[PDB]
Each structure stands twice: as C-alpha cells, then as structure tokens.
C-alpha cells in the first residue's frame, strides 16, 4: 500500500533513532558546541565537514558515517570547483535532505539516522550560528538555539529549554549540555567545538586533560 510504506518505514526508522545514544548541539559565545554520549574511542559521531561547517549524527553508525563521507566529498568538490567561502552550511543541509528523502523512498530500508549540520561565521566576521536538523525522511528544520538528536529527546530538550543562555561561555555551555544530556566523564563523552575565532578551520576537538579541566 502507498499508505502502508510511508507509515511503516516511518516507524522502522524512528525506532532505530530512539534506539541510540543522545547528542546535543548548542550555540554559545565562541560558536557552536557538540556534546555526544560516546563510549568508543575510535567510532565518532561529530565531524568537520568544511572550514566553518560541522556535523553531528545519531542512529546507525555505518549509515550516518556513509552520509558523513558523502558530505565531505560534496563540500570539497564544491570548494575546489568554485571557492572555499562559497560552500555554506545551507547547501550541505539541503543535500542531506534530498539524499535522505531519496533513500527513504527508493532504498529497501530507510536510514535510521538523524543529522545536524552546524555553521558559524568566518574569521573576524559577525553572524549568528545556524543549526539545521535533517530527519530520516528528508525533512529539514531551522533551529535557533540547540538541536537534540537520538534516544529520548524530550527530557534533554526541556532541561536545555530551562538552562539555555545566549552568549554563555564555553565552560557554562559545557555544563548546561552535560547536565541536560544526563536527564558522564571524559571516557564517555565526545566533545568538539566550531570555534568562530579560528582563522580558517573552525572545528576543534576537546579531549583528554583539556576536556577534564573544562568540565
């Protein structure tokens, strides 16, 4: 049935998205902060996409890593074909939406993934951080403050709703994000930033002892 597919595929992928760890991304003074609950040391759910565009995901690792790789491919081919400052978070988000829609309608099984594409302004420039959430069907949503992906999103989203503060420093945004995520030590957290102050490459991981000091 046309109705059966849409209702059944939707349930199969929303299940697999709630059947995974939780990631949050939020805006703070220096850019955007990604905080994910990740036990492994080799498998990662946060990644650089382009100079100022970062990426977080929640679901089935092989698939959102497939999307991670595709997005990297896309961004670099554009940046070389035109220029670096022409690739924007908006284009990337749009490509992920088209691709997840095509997958959701044409492939056998829908990608049980949830994506968040983040963008900050260039160096010495002024502009608000942009967060986009792309869901398994191709839907794309523009978020002003924070995105929560995977697992049970309600309690984390509400805790962030009470604790969020614009222009919070890096340490406060880390405390808020870890607290709302609990609703975990350096051995179970994947933390990275899109630091708007870096000259070119904005993405920067915060691991080990530096992460220890921040939290």
């Amino acid at each position: 049935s046309p109705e059966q597919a849409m209702r059944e595929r939707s349930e199969l992928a929303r299940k697999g998205i709630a059947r995974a760890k939780s990631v949050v991304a939020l805006a703070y003074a220096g850019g955007v902060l990604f905080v994910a609950e990740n036990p492994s040391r080799s498998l990662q759910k946060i990644s650089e996409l382009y100079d100022r565009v970062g990426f977080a995901a929640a679901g089935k690792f092989n698939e959102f890593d497939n999307l991670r790789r595709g997005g990297i491919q896309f961004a670099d081919t554009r940046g070389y074909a035109y220029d670096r400052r022409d690739v924007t978070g908006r284009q990337l988000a749009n490509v992920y939406a088209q691709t997840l829609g095509t997958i959701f309608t044409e492939q056998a099984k829908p990608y049980e993934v949830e994506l968040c594409v983040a963008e900050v302004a260039h160096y010495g420039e002024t502009k608000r951080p942009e967060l986009y959430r792309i869901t398994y069907d191709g839907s794309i949503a523009d978020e002003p403050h924070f995105v929560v992906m995977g697992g049970t999103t309600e309690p984390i989203a509400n805790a962030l709703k009470e604790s969020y503060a614009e222009n919070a420093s890096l340490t406060d945004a880390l405390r808020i994000a870890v607290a709302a995520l609990r609703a975990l030590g350096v051995a179970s957290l994947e933390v990275a930033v899109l630091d708007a102050n870096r000259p070119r490459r904005a993405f920067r991981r915060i691991t080990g002892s530096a992460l220890q000091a921040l939290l």
Binding site: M6, A97, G101, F104, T105, D137, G138, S139, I140
Partner: peptide, 5 residues
C-alpha cells in the same frame, strides 16, 4: 515524509 512547502 513530512517535507511539504
């Protein structure tokens, strides 16, 4: 797929 503009 709830993406209708």
């Amino acid at each position: 797929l709830g993406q209708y503009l």
